[PDB]
Structure 1
Amino acid sequence: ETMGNVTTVLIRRPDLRYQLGFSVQNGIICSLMRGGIAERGGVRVGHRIIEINGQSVVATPHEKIVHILSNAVGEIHMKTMPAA
């Protein structure tokens, strides 16, 4: 599993008030807040989140993907691809 163009991201989130800092739609990063944790994480726009903290969310719906990101803090391992 995890083949090809995968760019793992580590988000280190202090708590829930420190939101990701990137706008995602359906798992695809649409925008990134510069200076935010996501930038520090290595998140880039035009990337598709394929996994979050050990669960492949690439087949996970919008809500779920967002709900999961919204509640996860600490060292967060995501796997992103160039949305291809």
Structure 2
Amino acid sequence: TSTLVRVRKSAATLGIAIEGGANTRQPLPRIVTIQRGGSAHNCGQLKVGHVILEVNGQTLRGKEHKEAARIIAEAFKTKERDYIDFLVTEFNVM
């Protein structure tokens, strides 16, 4: 139903694009691009079409597009850890 994917910061970029966010018909962001050479692509495990439920355990429910993108960018840039955990689904979660 849902998968926790740990992306190690193996490259200088994360290399994903997301669409949607709160107050749209795609209320949780969906991954639309995974760029070769970036940390996400290097990880084996994210897919175009994955919906991001949580970033490092923080729900994205309620976060409009720009804010969801800001949180993900901060999770990548922070020196708090050398990885980002994405909770994702290919379908829907109850």
- TM-score bucket (shorter structure): 0.7 to 0.9
List runs of 5+ in structure 2 lacking aligned partners: 21-28, 77-81
Given that residues 9 and 41 in structure 1 are in contact (C-alpha distance below 8 angstroms), is that contact kept between their aligned partners in structure 2?
no
The alpha carbon displacement at 1:41 in A equals 5.4
Please state if 1:54 is matched with 2:57: yes
List runs of 5+ in structure 1 lacking aligned partners: none
Secondary structure, counterpart of 2:7 in structure 1: strand
Runs of 4+ in 1 over 2 A off after TM superposition: none
TM-score (norm 2): 0.70
The alpha carbon displacement at 1:14 in A equals 5.8
How many residues matched? Answer: 78
Larger Rg: 2
TM-score (norm 1): 0.77
Q: Structure 1's 19 and 58: CA in aligned 2 closer, same or farther, altered over 3 A?
A: farther
Deviations 1:8-64 (A, max 9, x none): 11122268xx23211111210011112321121521100100000110113322111
**Which one of 25, 31, 35 corresponds to residue 33 of structure 2?**
31
Q: Structure 1's 14 and 35: CA in aligned 2 closer, same or farther, altered over 3 A?
A: closer
C-alpha separation in 2, matches of 1:22 and 1:63: 14
Given that residues 49 and 58 in structure 1 are in contact (C-alpha distance below 8 angstroms), is that contact kept between their aligned partners in structure 2?
no
C-alpha separation in 2, matches of 1:33 and 1:59: 27
C-alpha separation in 2, matches of 1:11 and 1:23: 15
